[PDB]
Amino acid sequence: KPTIAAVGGYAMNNGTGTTLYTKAADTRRSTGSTTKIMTAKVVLAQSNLNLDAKVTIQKAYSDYVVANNASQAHLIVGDKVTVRQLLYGLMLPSGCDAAYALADKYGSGSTRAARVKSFIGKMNTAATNLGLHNTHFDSFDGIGNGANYSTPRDLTKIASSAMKNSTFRTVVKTKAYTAKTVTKTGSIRTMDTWKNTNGLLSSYSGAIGVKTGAGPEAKYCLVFAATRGGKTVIGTVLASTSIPARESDATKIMNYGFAL
């Protein structure tokens, strides 16, 4: 059993559900942007889902990333961006502006505030439906709050559920993506290329996911997944000490899991 810097860790065989590694696996901690996995999951399960549906980037999305010094996809106010493009902006550079856009779009309500509230409710309803008991969302992106928490086991179960969706799988294993959006003049704008923050995609052979996280309370987090020899290992590390450490933590757990 490897030792890791993260104070919380968990991994299982994605196909069988069998546990492969644990370290305070059921201890509630902050999630950082790994919460965005649930945001993507909820969006992709909406009945009225249309990946080609366009969303106008509101000034509020930009003001939001600035006010919260949140990671962003650099979405340009006024641009028309598709839900598919928003999902890539959400998962690759960890676009909290894209998260806001998705919540505004899919929440139920007559105001952005009401729709955001409704969307977070959907996130909690999805957790409940998975039979989770140590997870609660108070945001659509993991930005702030003691009422936003999960555990390495719970997040791994949310990730496993999300990975059942082919679109989700396609997105989280993508290393680079360049969005071509529509400007106010109708012209097509080529945005700066987005790079997936998950270093495992290039450093770990067989890696297929899933999502990074890093904040003042959550520290360095990573939900990982890789497939080798017909076996898929999926897991989560919470509160590692740095980006390089979170990557090695995950690398060790997966290597251990594949050898078990």
Short mmCIF file of C-alpha atoms in Angstrom, two decimals:
data_model
loop_
_atom_site.label_atom_id
_atom_site.label_comp_id
_atom_site.label_asym_id
_atom_site.label_seq_id
_atom_site.Cartn_x
_atom_site.Cartn_y
_atom_site.Cartn_z
CA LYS A 1 0.00 0.00 0.00
CA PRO A 2 1.51 3.33 -1.08
CA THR A 3 1.71 6.38 1.17
CA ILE A 4 0.30 9.64 -0.18
CA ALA A 5 0.41 13.32 0.77
CA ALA A 6 -3.36 13.68 0.45
CA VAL A 7 -5.23 13.37 3.75
CA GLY A 8 -8.16 11.78 1.95
CA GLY A 9 -8.03 9.05 -0.67
CA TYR A 10 -10.09 6.32 -2.34
CA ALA A 11 -10.03 4.10 -5.41
CA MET A 12 -12.12 1.24 -6.72
CA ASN A 13 -12.47 -1.04 -9.72
CA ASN A 14 -14.96 0.96 -11.79
CA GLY A 15 -16.58 -2.11 -13.27
CA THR A 16 -16.95 -4.21 -10.12
CA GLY A 17 -17.23 -1.52 -7.45
CA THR A 18 -14.60 -3.29 -5.36
CA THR A 19 -12.47 -1.06 -3.15
CA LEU A 20 -8.76 -0.97 -3.97
CA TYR A 21 -7.48 1.79 -1.70
CA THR A 22 -8.67 3.86 1.27
CA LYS A 23 -7.39 6.70 3.46
CA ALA A 24 -10.05 8.55 5.47
CA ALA A 25 -12.31 7.59 2.55
CA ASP A 26 -15.49 8.73 4.29
CA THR A 27 -14.17 11.90 5.95
CA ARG A 28 -15.96 15.04 4.76
CA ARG A 29 -13.71 17.72 3.27
CA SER A 30 -13.88 20.63 0.85
CA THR A 31 -13.96 19.69 -2.84
CA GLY A 32 -12.61 22.63 -4.79
CA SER A 33 -13.52 22.47 -8.49
CA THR A 34 -14.08 18.70 -8.40
CA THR A 35 -17.68 19.74 -7.65
CA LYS A 36 -17.85 20.61 -11.37
CA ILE A 37 -18.11 16.88 -12.10
CA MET A 38 -21.61 16.96 -10.58
CA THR A 39 -22.44 20.09 -12.58
CA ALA A 40 -21.54 18.31 -15.84
CA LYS A 41 -23.43 15.19 -14.73
CA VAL A 42 -26.63 17.10 -13.96
CA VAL A 43 -26.46 19.01 -17.26
CA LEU A 44 -26.00 15.86 -19.35
CA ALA A 45 -28.97 14.16 -17.67
CA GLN A 46 -31.43 17.00 -18.36
CA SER A 47 -34.47 15.97 -20.41
CA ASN A 48 -34.33 19.13 -22.52
CA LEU A 49 -30.60 18.67 -23.20
CA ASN A 50 -29.32 19.99 -26.54
CA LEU A 51 -25.53 20.12 -26.92
CA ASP A 52 -25.95 22.59 -29.79
CA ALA A 53 -28.14 24.98 -27.79
CA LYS A 54 -26.53 28.43 -27.70
CA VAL A 55 -26.05 30.48 -24.53
CA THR A 56 -25.22 34.20 -24.50
CA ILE A 57 -22.32 34.94 -22.16
CA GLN A 58 -23.72 37.34 -19.56
CA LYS A 59 -21.68 40.11 -17.95
CA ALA A 60 -22.46 38.37 -14.62
CA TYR A 61 -20.44 35.29 -15.56
CA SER A 62 -17.35 37.44 -16.06
CA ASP A 63 -17.93 39.64 -13.01
CA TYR A 64 -18.30 36.42 -11.02
CA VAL A 65 -14.91 34.91 -11.88
CA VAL A 66 -13.30 38.28 -11.13
CA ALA A 67 -15.06 38.77 -7.79
CA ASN A 68 -14.21 35.26 -6.63
CA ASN A 69 -10.80 35.08 -8.27
CA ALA A 70 -12.06 31.82 -9.75
CA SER A 71 -10.43 29.72 -12.47
CA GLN A 72 -12.06 30.51 -15.83
CA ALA A 73 -12.52 29.56 -19.48
CA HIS A 74 -12.21 33.23 -20.51
CA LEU A 75 -15.67 33.29 -22.08
CA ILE A 76 -16.27 36.64 -23.77
CA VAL A 77 -19.30 38.67 -22.71
CA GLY A 78 -21.80 38.88 -25.53
CA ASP A 79 -20.61 35.75 -27.32
CA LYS A 80 -23.00 32.91 -28.16
CA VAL A 81 -21.54 29.63 -26.85
CA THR A 82 -22.99 26.12 -27.18
CA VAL A 83 -23.68 23.82 -24.24
CA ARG A 84 -21.07 21.43 -25.66
CA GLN A 85 -18.49 24.22 -25.72
CA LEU A 86 -19.50 25.15 -22.14
CA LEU A 87 -18.95 21.55 -21.01
CA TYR A 88 -15.40 21.64 -22.40
CA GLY A 89 -14.82 25.07 -20.85
CA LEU A 90 -16.08 23.67 -17.56
CA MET A 91 -13.94 20.53 -17.49
CA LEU A 92 -10.65 21.42 -19.17
CA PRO A 93 -9.39 24.78 -17.82
CA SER A 94 -11.90 24.48 -14.95
CA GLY A 95 -14.10 27.32 -16.13
CA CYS A 96 -16.18 28.60 -13.23
CA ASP A 97 -17.72 31.10 -15.67
CA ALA A 98 -18.83 28.12 -17.78
CA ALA A 99 -20.25 26.51 -14.61
CA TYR A 100 -22.27 29.65 -13.92
CA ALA A 101 -23.51 29.65 -17.53
CA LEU A 102 -24.62 26.01 -17.29
CA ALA A 103 -26.43 26.53 -13.97
CA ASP A 104 -28.17 29.64 -15.34
CA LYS A 105 -29.24 27.66 -18.39
CA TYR A 106 -30.51 24.49 -16.73
CA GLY A 107 -31.85 25.65 -13.39
CA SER A 108 -35.58 26.38 -13.14
CA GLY A 109 -36.55 29.99 -12.39
CA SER A 110 -37.33 33.45 -13.73
CA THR A 111 -34.10 35.07 -12.50
CA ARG A 112 -30.48 33.96 -12.67
CA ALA A 113 -30.48 33.87 -8.87
CA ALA A 114 -33.52 31.59 -8.81
CA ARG A 115 -32.14 29.30 -11.53
CA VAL A 116 -28.79 29.00 -9.75
CA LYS A 117 -30.58 27.99 -6.56
CA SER A 118 -32.67 25.46 -8.46
CA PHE A 119 -29.63 23.97 -10.20
CA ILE A 120 -27.78 23.43 -6.92
CA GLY A 121 -30.91 21.66 -5.71
CA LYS A 122 -30.66 19.34 -8.71
CA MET A 123 -27.05 18.60 -7.72
CA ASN A 124 -28.12 17.62 -4.22
CA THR A 125 -31.02 15.58 -5.61
CA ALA A 126 -28.55 13.71 -7.81
CA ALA A 127 -26.37 12.95 -4.77
CA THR A 128 -29.41 11.64 -2.91
CA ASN A 129 -30.36 9.48 -5.88
CA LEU A 130 -26.90 7.89 -5.79
CA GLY A 131 -27.48 6.93 -2.17
CA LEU A 132 -24.78 9.30 -0.92
CA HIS A 133 -24.78 10.48 2.71
CA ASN A 134 -21.57 12.50 3.10
CA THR A 135 -22.03 14.99 0.27
CA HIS A 136 -23.71 18.40 0.09
CA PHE A 137 -23.52 21.15 -2.50
CA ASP A 138 -23.95 24.86 -1.87
CA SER A 139 -22.44 25.94 -5.20
CA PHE A 140 -22.26 24.90 -8.86
CA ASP A 141 -18.47 25.08 -8.89
CA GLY A 142 -17.11 24.40 -5.41
CA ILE A 143 -16.43 28.09 -4.80
CA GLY A 144 -16.78 28.75 -1.08
CA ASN A 145 -18.90 27.46 1.81
CA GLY A 146 -18.75 25.06 4.74
CA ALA A 147 -21.96 23.58 3.36
CA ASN A 148 -20.11 22.36 0.27
CA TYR A 149 -18.33 19.10 0.97
CA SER A 150 -17.89 15.48 -0.04
CA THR A 151 -15.55 12.55 0.57
CA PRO A 152 -13.07 10.60 -1.54
CA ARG A 153 -15.55 7.70 -1.73
CA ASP A 154 -18.59 9.85 -2.54
CA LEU A 155 -16.81 11.86 -5.24
CA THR A 156 -15.53 8.62 -6.78
CA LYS A 157 -19.09 7.31 -6.91
CA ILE A 158 -20.28 10.56 -8.52
CA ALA A 159 -17.48 10.32 -11.09
CA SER A 160 -18.25 6.67 -11.82
CA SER A 161 -21.90 7.61 -12.40
CA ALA A 162 -20.94 10.51 -14.69
CA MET A 163 -18.57 8.27 -16.68
CA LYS A 164 -21.57 6.22 -17.81
CA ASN A 165 -22.27 9.10 -20.21
CA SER A 166 -20.29 8.98 -23.48
CA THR A 167 -20.21 12.77 -23.81
CA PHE A 168 -18.78 13.11 -20.33
CA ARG A 169 -16.11 10.50 -21.14
CA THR A 170 -15.21 12.23 -24.38
CA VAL A 171 -14.80 15.57 -22.61
CA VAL A 172 -12.70 14.55 -19.61
CA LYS A 173 -10.15 12.64 -21.66
CA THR A 174 -9.62 15.60 -24.02
CA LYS A 175 -6.20 17.23 -23.66
CA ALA A 176 -6.86 20.34 -25.73
CA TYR A 177 -9.93 22.07 -27.16
CA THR A 178 -10.34 25.31 -29.13
CA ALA A 179 -13.83 26.83 -29.10
CA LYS A 180 -15.07 28.71 -32.15
CA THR A 181 -17.78 30.97 -30.76
CA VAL A 182 -20.22 33.42 -32.36
CA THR A 183 -19.71 37.16 -31.82
CA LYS A 184 -22.32 39.94 -31.79
CA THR A 185 -21.63 40.56 -35.48
CA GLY A 186 -22.32 36.91 -36.17
CA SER A 187 -18.66 36.36 -37.00
CA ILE A 188 -16.90 33.25 -35.72
CA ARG A 189 -14.28 33.87 -33.06
CA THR A 190 -11.46 31.41 -32.46
CA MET A 191 -10.89 31.43 -28.71
CA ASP A 192 -7.48 30.75 -27.19
CA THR A 193 -6.98 26.99 -26.87
CA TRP A 194 -8.08 25.33 -23.64
CA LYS A 195 -5.80 22.75 -22.01
CA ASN A 196 -7.03 20.10 -19.57
CA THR A 197 -5.59 20.82 -16.10
CA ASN A 198 -5.35 17.07 -15.46
CA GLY A 199 -1.66 16.25 -15.99
CA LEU A 200 -2.35 12.51 -15.78
CA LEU A 201 -3.80 12.70 -19.29
CA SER A 202 -0.27 13.05 -20.59
CA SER A 203 1.81 11.55 -17.75
CA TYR A 204 -0.14 8.38 -16.96
CA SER A 205 -0.49 5.76 -19.67
CA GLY A 206 -4.12 4.72 -19.98
CA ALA A 207 -5.49 7.79 -18.16
CA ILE A 208 -9.05 8.75 -19.16
CA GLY A 209 -10.17 11.28 -16.53
CA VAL A 210 -11.45 13.01 -14.63
CA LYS A 211 -11.15 16.43 -12.92
CA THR A 212 -8.81 18.59 -10.84
CA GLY A 213 -9.46 20.91 -7.90
CA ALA A 214 -7.43 23.36 -5.80
CA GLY A 215 -8.52 25.94 -3.23
CA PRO A 216 -7.71 27.53 0.18
CA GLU A 217 -9.88 25.05 2.03
CA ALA A 218 -9.80 22.05 -0.34
CA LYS A 219 -6.08 22.28 -1.08
CA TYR A 220 -4.98 20.11 -4.02
CA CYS A 221 -7.56 17.63 -5.28
CA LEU A 222 -7.91 15.20 -8.16
CA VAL A 223 -10.53 12.70 -9.30
CA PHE A 224 -8.69 10.20 -11.51
CA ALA A 225 -9.45 7.27 -13.82
CA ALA A 226 -7.33 5.05 -16.07
CA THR A 227 -7.78 1.80 -17.97
CA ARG A 228 -5.08 -0.86 -18.31
CA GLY A 229 -5.38 -4.50 -19.31
CA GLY A 230 -9.16 -4.44 -19.44
CA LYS A 231 -9.39 -2.96 -15.95
CA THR A 232 -10.50 0.57 -15.07
CA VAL A 233 -9.38 2.14 -11.80
CA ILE A 234 -11.25 5.24 -10.64
CA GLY A 235 -10.62 7.23 -7.48
CA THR A 236 -10.15 10.55 -5.70
CA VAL A 237 -7.54 12.30 -3.59
CA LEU A 238 -8.53 15.27 -1.46
CA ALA A 239 -6.23 17.79 0.17
CA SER A 240 -2.91 16.75 -1.31
CA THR A 241 -0.12 19.31 -0.75
CA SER A 242 0.59 20.54 -4.28
CA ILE A 243 -0.16 19.91 -7.91
CA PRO A 244 2.87 17.64 -8.47
CA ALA A 245 2.02 15.81 -5.23
CA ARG A 246 -1.62 15.28 -6.19
CA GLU A 247 -0.50 13.78 -9.49
CA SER A 248 2.03 11.41 -7.89
CA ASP A 249 -0.53 10.51 -5.20
CA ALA A 250 -2.98 9.45 -7.92
CA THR A 251 -0.25 7.73 -9.93
CA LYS A 252 0.76 5.60 -6.96
CA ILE A 253 -2.83 4.64 -6.10
CA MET A 254 -3.63 3.59 -9.66
CA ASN A 255 -0.37 1.65 -10.02
CA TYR A 256 -1.16 -0.09 -6.74
CA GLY A 257 -4.73 -0.76 -7.82
CA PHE A 258 -3.69 -2.32 -11.12
CA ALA A 259 -1.19 -4.60 -9.37
CA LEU A 260 -3.61 -5.89 -6.72
#
